[PDB]
């Protein structure tokens, strides 16, 4: 089997992408944020504290003939910005782009933090990291991909994110019409539960390429590109007036600036992020200070190849016995 679904930016800055997901019988469609940096499928639901729901679409398991309470199971998770959610668990049928998993763990939120409440465009998350990061207790659960794997034509999924435009998630096949040239595959470490790999270096703008190993994760659920402070300083030093702002929380630059591109290595191949992809607009409405799309990972403990990097590529998440990652230009 295979599945194919369109993913759409939630706003004009590509802050996140949402993909429609069908849950239950009859189907309930929720727009979920696919997150290759976590491993929980959780949704706003009929169990969510009413004061914490504001415009989201909810899952109502009592309306699904296929829903079953996963008795005793609970979950709790927090994300990169300090947001969090928690609740109990059902199993139900879940379909993504025509691909169906029966008995999928669907984590029903009882509680969500304020920034989830305040974002009406995201109805929950669908984790696509390794199942070893799933937070359900006392019986850890598998991700949608893990569950689907044995049914798929090939044990892969691909992410083709758009810049200010829709893109695609495919399961079970590689669309050879979606990229240019060849796919370069690179080794993955699963020891921390992530799609963790090592980039071979970087360049800023038309500068010379610096060969240096940069360990990091391929993370569709992180908006920005988080790299070592050395790398990020070298980038922003090429932008007149750019500076790191403690009050704002990262590098900002004059909104009058045209930004240089950023290149990262994949083996002997190169992926080029156009400068416009690194511009995240005014720090506040009307401001002439703009927020940068490349930020320091210092303090995170890990480098993150988030959407800013991934949307410049066609990315293959290969879940074979020995997992790998592939990157192509597009």
The domain spans of the chain are: 5-174, 175-330
Look at residues 44, 90, 40 and name the one whose alpha carbon lies nearest to residue 67: 90
For residues 43 and 70, the answer to whether their CB atoms sit within 8 Å is no
Q: For residue 326, give every residue at least 6 positions away whose Cβ sits within 8 Å of its Cβ, in sequence order, or none.
A: 183, 184, 185, 186, 315, 316, 318
d(CA 297, CA 306): 12
Q: Nearest 5°: phi and psi at 69?
A: -60, 130
Q: For residue 306, give every residue at least 6 positions away whose Cβ sits within 8 Å of its Cβ, in sequence order, or none.
A: 219, 220, 221, 222, 223, 224, 225, 226
**Of the residues 85, 95, 108, 199, which is catalytic?**
199
d(CA 265, CA 242): 25
Q: What distances in angstroms separate CA 299 from CA 99, 169, 267, 304, one per listed residue?
A: 39, 31, 27, 12
Q: 241: buried, middle or exposed (CB in 10 Å: 19+, 13-18, 0-12)?
A: exposed
**Of the residues 35, 92, 123, 307, which is catalytic?**
35
Could you tell me the fold of the domain covering 5-174?
Cathepsin D, subunit A; domain 1 (2.40.70)
Answer yes or no: same fold for 5-174 and 175-330. yes
Catalytic residue status for 35? yes
**209's tokens:** 């390429």
d(CA 93, CA 161): 26
The second-level CATH assignment, the architecture, of 175-330 is: Beta Barrel (2.40)
Look at residues 146, 90, 120, 159 and name the one whose alpha carbon lies nearest to residue 309: 159
Task: Give the 3-state secondary structure of residue 116.
Answer: helix
Q: What distances in angstroms separate CA 304 from CA 95, 268, 278, 296, 310, one per listed residue?
A: 28, 20, 15, 10, 10
For residues 125 and 42, the answer to whether their CB atoms sit within 8 Å is yes
Look at residues 184, 161, 162, 167 and name the one whose alpha carbon lies nearest to residue 327: 184
């Amino acid at each position: 089997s295979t599945g194919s679904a369109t993913t759409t930016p939630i706003d004009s800055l590509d802050d996140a992408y949402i993909t429609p997901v069908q849950i239950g019988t009859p189907a309930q469609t929720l727009n979920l944020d696919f997150d290759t940096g976590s491993s929980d499928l959780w949704v706003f639901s009929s169990e969510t504290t009413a004061s914490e729901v504001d415009g989201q679409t909810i899952y109502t398991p009592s309306k699904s003939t296929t829903a079953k309470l996963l008795s005793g199971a609970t979950w709790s998770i927090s994300y990169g910005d300090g947001s969090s959610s928690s609740g109990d668990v059902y199993t139900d049928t879940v379909s993504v782009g025509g691909l169906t998993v029966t008995g999928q763990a669907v984590e029903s939120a009882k509680k969500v933090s304020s920034s989830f409440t305040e974002d009406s465009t995201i109805d929950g998350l669908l984790g696509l990291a390794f199942s070893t990061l799933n937070t359900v207790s006392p019986t850890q659960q598998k991700t949608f991909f893990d569950n689907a794997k044995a049914s798929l034509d090939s044990p892969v999924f691909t992410a083709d994110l758009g810049y200010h435009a829709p893109g695609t998630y495919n399961f079970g096949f590689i669309d050879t019409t979606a990229y240019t040239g060849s796919i370069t595959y690179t080794a993955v470490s699963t020891k921390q539960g992530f799609w963790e790999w090592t980039s071979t270096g970087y360049a800023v703008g038309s500068g010379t390429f610096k060969s240096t190993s940069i360990d990091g994760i391929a993370d569709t659920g992180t908006t920005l590109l988080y790299l070592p402070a050395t790398v990020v300083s070298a980038y922003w030093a090429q932008v007149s007036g750019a500076k790191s702002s403690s009050s704002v929380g990262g590098y900002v630059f004059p909104c009058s600036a045209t930004l240089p591109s950023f290149t990262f290595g994949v083996g002997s191949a190169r992926i080029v992020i156009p400068g416009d992809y690194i511009d995240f607009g005014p720090i506040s409405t009307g401001s002439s200070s703009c927020f940068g799309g490349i930020q320091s990972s210092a303090g995170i403990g890990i480098n993150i190849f988030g959407d800013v990097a991934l949307k410049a590529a066609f990315v293959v998440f290969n879940g074979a016995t020995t997992p790998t990652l592939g990157f192509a230009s597009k």
